[PDB]
Paper text:
The replicative DNA pol from bacteriophage RB69 (RB69pol) is a member of the B family and is responsible for DNA synthesis of both leading and lagging strands of its genome. It has extensive sequence similarity to human replicative pols α and δ and therefore has been regarded as a good model for B family pols. Our previous reported 1.8 Å resolution structure of wt RB69pol showed that L415 is located right below the triphosphate tail of the incoming dNTP, where a small hydrophobic cavity exists at the tip of the L415 side chain. To provide a structural basis that could account for the different kinetic behavior observed among L415 variants and wt RB69pol, we determined the crystal structures of three ternary complexes: dTTP/dA-with the L415A mutant; dATP/dT-with the L415G mutant and dATP/dT-with the L415M mutant with resolutions ranging from 1.80 to 2.04 Å and Rfree values ranging from 21.3% to 21.9%.
Interestingly, the rotameric position of D411 as observed in the wt structure is restored in the L415M mutant. Overall, the structure of the L415M ternary complex is much closer to the structure of the wt RB69pol ternary complex than the structure of either the L415A or L415G ternary complexes. Accommodation of the M415 side chain in the hydrophobic cavity without disturbing the nearby residues could provide an energetic advantage to this mutant over wt RB69pol forming the conformation required for dNTP incorporation. A more rigid anchor of the metal ions would likely facilitate the alignment between the 3′-OH and Pα of the incoming dNTP. Together, these structural interpretations help explain the increased catalytic efficiency of the L415M mutant over wt RB69pol. Interestingly, when L415 was replaced with Met, an amino acid with a longer side-chain, the base selectivity was not compromised. In contrast, the L415 to Met substitution would be expected to restrict the movement of nearby residues. Therefore, the partitioning between the pol and exo domains is not significantly compromised with the L415M mutant.
Residue numbers in the entry: 1 to 901
The structure:
DNA sequence: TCGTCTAAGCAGTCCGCG
DNA sequence: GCGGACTGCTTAG
């Protein structure tokens, strides 16, 4: 097999590399890598190296990496550009793996671990590590085993051995319900004392050294705790055995409000699963506890126990250990679903970077571009300092707030990456500038043609047309990968809808789910067999289809994220290729494109309808347009339609055969006007929306920019078994809105769009009457909590104190004295509830850590003093008032002359 | 929240507005 | 009470 790296580090003048050799064996080597850098040289000098602008360069070969680094400094002292890859390990990888890497994940040791630490006096601080580590569960992907290290004797209590037999039993048998599928994979090791546990753990770690290290909060908690505890007990040299090169660094992580410390283990790639999840999941969660996320992702029940976790080991050590094992397994289950480790490996090996660098699109793109240019003997420029400067973004149309009955939406495929490719926007393709007219002059095609030679953007920039820039070339490769995975995702989605339909008529039989690839549209033979299956088999197939769709979603949306982040990197001062001329060229072309096509679509539809000056495009944001189809439906007449699906087919046909060709023509003209390199503005129909045929539903409404709801029957070619609400920006979509209020507002919207005013009024009247019974957590607001210190003046709110911070300060006073009740953590999330006048807490609200029950000593008082009236008015009635006034209807029945009877 | 970008919404504080 | 200046937070792209 072809060799591939696992990890790479620079330590002084050595590169330390762990890798898989040609026989599939893990090896480690130390290499005295001699880097090269470059300087500009005179024209009359036969070199093969040229900078990205075609200027000749001479290669400088250094005796060692420190010499190269010293040379860079002196070049700054002189005031001359020092060209080339200054991150020497990336140059090492490029030289060592000069081919497309094919990796074998089965050879990469992926470790998932979690530790337990009993602490009587509050949260056990990793930097102090003053309490014994009393449990470690470490899952190894190569062995496929959970290694359990269990401390039986501690200053906080001596306990009996954990029993695998009780662990496997149902909770109704007094057991822990450790999943049967992992029972045989547990290797249990009890220990008489902490010193022997840790020494054995280090010997184990040496035998089975993680390449990828993950878990939940491992970077902020488990790793620094283990490191510091070993350091405290045994000394520094022993703690450094966590690094296969015996090198570590205490690294400070800084932001706006303060800083924290993590341990860098040289030769390990730490990918904390919480960080993978936050970057790649495209969720915003009220809480990031593993328990909360596991429930959300897997629909598993909360890991339940009595008393505080600080007394769990001594009260129920059996459960204590079982829950530690289950916690490790939960992370593996989330990854089986979301596949973020797979994603990270794919991206890391593609770019030829340290796997942990996948968190940084700037590092990722720097390496992709460097490797690309190196292939042509071209030399990358030196990174420079730039001051942060604001620059303009997308256009968003101001909608008229209203109901909108029939709506068709259209959207540009991968807009900004397509603009880059179409215009040929790249650091080395800049050709010059032209004199800019106001944007509306280009939008209305009255401005002079910018250039007869170069490819243009309406911000004044011109680009070469003779060859593709490196940015268009590399962005195209990732875009093409994204396109493939989006295809699999959408097929799985369509396949899912086939199963949902069949589930309406499940056969009374005993059978099996079909063995199929859900990434491909089901054949006619599969569709025929599906119609004969039982509900059991259909449900299992639906689960599998939805898992395939999730897998596809991860792969496609994060490739989209990467290419969109290359645009973003052009506007980030730390990117080697930062250039606000290119960043604004992209965004300004984008503004033109949307408003250009708005004009074209209006002109086309006014023509086919025989009207003048009427606005069919009701809304647009960045690269999308929303087209009122009322007049199209009214031209055939509603009475002519057999059912909802009949008018959906008609609009689908109209959009594909009439609108899209008109849109394509409009964009081809715009491409010619700007003299672009290649027409790539492809705007396809997205949603078909409207009320159910014969109903009183309003179909859709807009309240303002970035705030609307639509009843959608077909989305990007997926025809739903049941209509789906597409709600953007409204309170139902915000993590700050209480869970039960999100649910109630969504039902109000469903009724508005599908059923009408009377239905909405029935539901509102019931929610208002019953809501006081809702669980306090389900009606609590949520917020991030930054700068608690700033607003704390002797335990009381200072000037301009935010409402949620005020709640935290109330909480802090109520739990004062306790180093056992949960503390609010700076920068994390809190639940917030309003408090009625005259309460014992002495303020108008209280806040506590999100994803948790409020501590029992104040729980009863919070419950007694909760202000349900304020809660209802603020989270539910206020937003609903906004929805209903925009849609021109009433959530409460107004008086009529019929009341006389 | 270490980690690519801008546009823009709403909640809330403070305070004017005769 | 509203809304403007402002902070804070959270969305849509
Ligand atoms: N996370 C982001 N970072 C930088 N730019 C973004 C991001 N999200 C959206 N944009 C910009 O907005 C444009 C339109 O966004 P949109 O959500 O329609 O995605 P898209 O790139 O057009 O891909 P799709 O093909 O899925 O529509 C993007 O092309 C760009
Ligand atoms: Ca735990
Ligand atoms: Ca798009
Ligand atoms: Ca599309
Ligand atoms: Ca059937
Ligand atoms: Ca869009
Ligand atoms: Ca206001």
């Amino acid at each position: 097999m072809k060799e591939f790296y696992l990890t790479v580090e620079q330590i002084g003048d050595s590169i330390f590399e762990r890798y898989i050799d040609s026989n599939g064996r893990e090896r480690t080597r130390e290499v005295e890598y001699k880097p090269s850098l470059f300087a500009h040289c005179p024209e009359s000098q036969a070199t093969k190296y040229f900078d990205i602008y075609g200027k000749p360069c001479t290669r400088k070969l250094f005796a060692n990496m420190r010499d190269a680094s010293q040379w860079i400094k002196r070049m700054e002292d002189i005031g001359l550009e020092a060209l080339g890859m200054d991150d020497f390990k990336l140059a090492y990888l490029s030289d060592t793996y000069n081919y497309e890497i094919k990796y074998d994940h089965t050879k990469i040791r992926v470790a998932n671990f979690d530790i337990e630490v009993t602490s009587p006096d509050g949260f056990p601080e990793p930097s102090q590590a003053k309490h014994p580590i009393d449990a470690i569960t470490h899952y190894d992907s190569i062995d496929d085993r959970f290694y359990v290290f269990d401390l039986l004797n501690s200053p906080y209590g001596n306990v009996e051995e954990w029993s695998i037999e009780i662990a496997a039993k149902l909770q109704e048998q007094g057991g822990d319900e450790v999943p049967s599928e992992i029972i045989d994979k547990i290797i249990y090791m009890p220990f008489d004392n902490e010193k022997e546990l840790l020494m054995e753990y280090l010997n184990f770690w040496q035998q089975k050294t993680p390449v990828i290290l993950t878990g939940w909060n491992v970077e902020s908690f488990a790793i620094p705790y283990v490191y510091n505890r070993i350091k405290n007990i045994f000394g520094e040299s022993t703690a450094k055995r966590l690094s296969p090169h015996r090198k570590t660094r205490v690294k400070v992580i800084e932001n706006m409000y303060g800083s924290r410390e993590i341990i860098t283990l040289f030769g390990i790639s730490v990918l904390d699963y919480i960080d993978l999840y936050k970057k790649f999941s495209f969720t915003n969660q009220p809480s990031y506890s593993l328990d909360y996320i596991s429930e959300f992702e897997l629909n598993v029940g909360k890991l339940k126990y009595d008393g505080p976790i600080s007394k769990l080991r001594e009260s129920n050590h059996q459960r204590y250990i079982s829950y530690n094992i289950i916690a490790v397994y939960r992370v593996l289950q989330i990854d089986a679903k979301r596949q973020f480790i797979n994603l990270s490996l794919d991206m890391g090996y593609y770019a030829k970077i340290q796997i942990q660098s996948v968190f940084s699109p700037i590092k990722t793109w720097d390496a992709i571009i460097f490797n690309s240019l190196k292939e042509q003997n071209k030399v990358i420029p030196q990174g420079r300092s730039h001051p942060v400067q604001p620059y303009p973004g997308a256009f968003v149309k101001e909608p008229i707030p209203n109901r909108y009955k029939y709506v068709m939406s259209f959207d540009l495929t991968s807009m900004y990456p397509s603009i880059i490719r179409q215009v040929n926007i790249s650091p080395e393709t800049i050709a010059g500038t032209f004199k800019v007219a106001p944007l509306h002059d280009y939008i209305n095609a009255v401005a002079e043609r910018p250039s007869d030679v170069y490819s243009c953007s309406p911000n004044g920039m011109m680009y070469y047309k003779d060859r593709d820039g490196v940015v268009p070339t590399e962005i195209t490769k990732v875009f093409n990968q994204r396109k493939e995975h989006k295809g699999y995702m959408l097929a799985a989605q369509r396949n899912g809808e086939i199963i949902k339909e069949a589930l309406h008529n499940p056969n009374l039989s005993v059978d099996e789910p079909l063995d199929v690839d859900y990434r491909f549209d089901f054949s006619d033979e599969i569709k025929e067999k599906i119609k004969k299956l039982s509900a059991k088999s259909l449900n299992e197939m639906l689960f599998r289809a939805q898992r395939t769709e999730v897998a596809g979603m991860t792969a496609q949306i994060n490739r989209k994220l990467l290419i969109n982040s290359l645009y973003g990197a052009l506007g980030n001062v730390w990117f080697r290729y930062y250039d606000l001329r290119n960043a604004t060229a992209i965004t300004t072309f984008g503004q033109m494109a949307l408003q250009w096509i708005e004009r074209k679509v209006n002109e086309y539809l006014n023509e086919v309808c025989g009207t003048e000056g009427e606005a069919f495009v009701l809304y647009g944001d960045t690269d999308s347009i929303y087209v009122s189809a009322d007049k199209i439906i009214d031209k055939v007449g509603e009475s002519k339609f057999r059912d909802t699906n009949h008018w959906v087919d008609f609009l689908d046909k109209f959009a594909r055969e009439r609108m899209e060709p008109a849109i394509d023509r409009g964009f081809r003209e715009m491409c010619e006007y700007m003299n672009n390199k290649q027409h790539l503005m492809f705007m396809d129909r997205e949603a078909i929306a409207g009320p159910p045929l014969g109903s009183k539903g309003i179909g859709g409404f807009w309240t303002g920019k970035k705030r609307y709801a639509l009843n959608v029957w077909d989305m990007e070619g997926t025809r739903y078994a049941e209509p789906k609400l597409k709600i953007m920006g409204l309170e139902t979509q915000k993590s700050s809105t209480p869970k039960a209020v999100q649910k109630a507002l969504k039902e109000c919207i469903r009724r508005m769009l599908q059923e009408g005013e009377e239905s909405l009024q029935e539901y509102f009247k019931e929610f208002e009457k019953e809501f006081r019974q809702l669980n306090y957590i389900s009606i609590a607001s949520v917020s991030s909590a930054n700068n608690i210190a700033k607003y704390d003046v002797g335990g009381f709110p200072g000037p301009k104190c935010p409402f949620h911070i005020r709640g935290i300060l109330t909480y802090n006073r109520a739990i004062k004295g306790n180093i056992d009740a949960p503390q609010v953590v700076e920068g994390e999330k809190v639940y917030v509830l309003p408090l009625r006048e005259g309460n014992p807490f002495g303020d108008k609200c209280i806040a506590w850590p999100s994803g948790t029950e409020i501590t029992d000593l104040i729980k009863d008082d919070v419950l007694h003093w909760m202000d349900y009236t304020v809660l209802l008015e603020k989270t539910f009635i206020k937003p609903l008032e906004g929805f209903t006034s925009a849609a021109k209807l009433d959530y409460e029945k107004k008086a009529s002359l019929f009341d006389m009877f």
